């Protein structure tokens, strides 16, 4: 029975990891874009077009 338990536990763990990390990252992105849209001196590719994307 512990095999079933560990399988369920790690499946739920992977689901939570993917979902929460994607959601948090997107939320931080949206807050930063709100700050830059409200301050267009900063609405510029301030890290770089490819640097941030590669990172």
């Amino acid at each position: 029975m512990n095999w079933l338990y560990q399988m369920i536990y790690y499946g739920v763990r992977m689901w939570l990891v993917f979902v929460l990390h994607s959601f948090s990252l997107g939320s931080f992105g949206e807050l930063i874009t709100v700050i830059t849209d409200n301050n267009l001196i900063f609405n510029v590719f301030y890290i770089g077009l490819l640097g941030l994307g590669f990172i």
């Binding site: 409200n38 301050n39 267009l40 001196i41």
Partner: protein, 68 residues
Amino acid sequence: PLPNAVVQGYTSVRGPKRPLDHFYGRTPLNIDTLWHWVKFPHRYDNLRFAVCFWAFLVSAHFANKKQR
């Protein structure tokens, strides 16, 4: 259509015209001799690019803040 006097510019006698002065030892100064002193802008072109960017950006910032 018009007489030869009108064409040649004189009725009887062609009058002498005083020639143009030259001012030896220096360039002529006329309305058409000014590019010798004033060429097209060539010294601050890159500063022009930078300042146009900064002007656009600062204007956009303050306009968005005013509108909001």
